C-alpha cells in the first residue's frame, strides 16, 4: 500500500486503493459491526 | 457491420449464446411457457371509450396551456428560423471553404507528461520532532 502511493496509477486504480484502511478498520471492528442486532435481517454464511 | 440488413429467420437474442436476466418480477412481460387477439382490441376500445369522459376537454386545455407557454418562449428551431433561411444563400464553394478546427494549445498542454508524486522530505519530520522540545530554563 505504501509502495503503491506513487507508481503511476490511473484514477480508478488509486480510487480503489484509497479504501484499504477502510477495509482494515471494518475488519478490526468485525465482532461488533457484523452483529445480528445492529443489522437486522437474513444472515448469509460465506461459501467456505 | 454497419449498413447491412439482418438475415432472414435469425433471432438476435440467439446466434450469440446470450442469456438474459430478471432483476425482479415486476418488470418485463409475463413469461409464457383467433378468439384471442380479438379480445385485446375489445378491451382497448373499452378503455379508450372510458377514457373519453374528459379526453377532448383536457386535450383542449393542454393545447391552450402549451400555446400560452410558447407565447413568450418560442421553440428552439423557431428562434433560428430566420438565420436558417438566410443559410440558403450560401453557395457550394463557400461550403467547401469552411476550415477544419485547430487546437491552439501545444503538446505540453494537450498531452502532458505524467505528473509524478514524491514523498515529503524527512527534513519535515525532523523539524516537527525537534519542535516541541522545551528549554529547562
Amino acid at each position: 500500500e505504501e509502495s503503491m502511493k506513487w507508481k503511476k496509477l490511473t484514477n480508478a486504480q488509486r480510487s480503489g486503493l484509497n479504501q484499504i484502511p477502510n477495509r482494515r478498520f471494518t475488519l478490526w471492528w468485525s465482532p461488533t459491526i457484523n452483529r445480528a442486532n445492529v443489522y437486522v435481517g437474513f444472515q448469509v454464511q460465506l461459501d467456505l | 457491420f454497419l449498413g447491412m440488413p439482418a438475415p432472414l429467420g435469425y433471432v438476435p437474442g440467439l446466434g450469440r449464446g446470450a442469456t438474459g436476466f430478471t432483476t425482479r418480477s415486476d418488470i418485463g412481460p409475463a413469461r409464457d411457457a383467433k378468439d384471442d387477439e380479438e379480445a385485446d382490441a375489445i378491451y382497448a376500445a373499452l378503455d379508450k371509450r372510458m377514457d373519453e369522459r374528459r379526453k377532448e376537454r383536457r386535450e383542449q386545455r393542454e393545447k391552450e396551456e402549451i400555446e400560452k407557454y410558447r407565447m413568450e418562449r418560442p421553440k428552439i428551431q423557431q428562434q433560428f428560423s430566420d438565420l436558417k433561411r438566410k443559410l440558403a444563400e450560401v453557395t457550394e464553394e463557400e461550403w467547401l471553404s469552411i476550415p477544419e478546427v485547430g487546437d491552439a494549445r501545444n503538446k505540453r498542454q494537450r498531452n502532458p507528461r505524467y505528473e509524478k508524486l514524491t514523498p515529503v522530505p524527512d527534513s519535515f519530520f525532523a523539524k516537527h520532532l525537534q519542535t516541541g522540545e522545551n528549554h529547562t530554563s
Binding site: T10, N11, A12, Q13, S15, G16 | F1, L2, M4, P5, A6, P7, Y10, V11, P12, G13, G15, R16, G17, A18, T19, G20, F21, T22, T23, I27, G28, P29
Partner: protein, 141 residues
C-alpha cells in the same frame, strides 16, 4: 448522440458484439430523444475518443430494436451494457442491479473509471467487476 454510431437492427448489434475481440463494447440502450439518454450520449461522446484504445461505443434505439427488451430488461429510460468477447459483464455498482447502468452519470471521469475497471476485470476472465466508486448513495448533501 447523433455523433456516435447507431445500430438499426438486432443483427447489427450481434455483429458489433462479436467483431470486438480485444475491446469492451459499451452499448447505450434507450431513445435518442430521452433527456437521460441525452446525458449518457453526451458523456459517452465526450469520452468516446479517450477510451478508444480499450473500448468502443454503439448506440441502439430500443424502439427500432426491441429484440433485447424482454431478455435484457430494456425498460428503463436509459441503460448501459458492457460486453467483452461476446459475454455480458456485470458491475457491482452498489445499486442492487449489477446487470446494467440504468441511471445517468454526470461525471465523465466516473464513466471512464467504470469502463477501465470493466476492461481490467473482463480481461482477467472475470464476469463481474467491482465498481471503483459506490453508487448506493448519490452523495448529495
Amino acid at each position: 448522440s447523433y455523433m456516435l454510431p447507431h445500430l438499426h437492427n438486432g443483427w447489427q448489434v450481434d455483429q458489433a458484439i462479436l467483431s470486438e475481440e480485444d475491446r469492451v463494447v459499451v452499448i447505450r440502450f434507450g431513445h435518442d430523444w430521452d433527456p437521460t439518454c441525452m446525458k449518457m450520449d453526451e458523456v459517452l461522446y465526450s469520452i468516446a475518443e479517450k477510451v478508444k484504445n480499450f473500448a468502443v461505443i454503439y448506440l441502439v434505439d430500443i424502439t427500432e430494436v426491441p429484440d433485447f427488451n424482454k431478455m435484457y430488461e430494456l425498460y428503463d429510460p436509459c441503460t448501459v451494457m458492457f460486453f467483452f468477447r461476446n459475454k455480458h459483464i456485470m458491475i457491482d455498482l452498489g445499486t442492487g442491479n449489477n446487470n446494467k447502468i440504468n441511471w445517468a452519470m454526470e461525471d465523465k471521469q466516473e464513466m471512464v473509471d467504470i469502463i477501465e475497471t470493466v476492461y481490467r476485470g473482463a480481461r482477467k476472465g472475470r464476469g463481474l467487476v467491482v465498481s471503483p466508486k459506490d453508487y448506493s448513495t448519490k452523495y448529495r448533501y
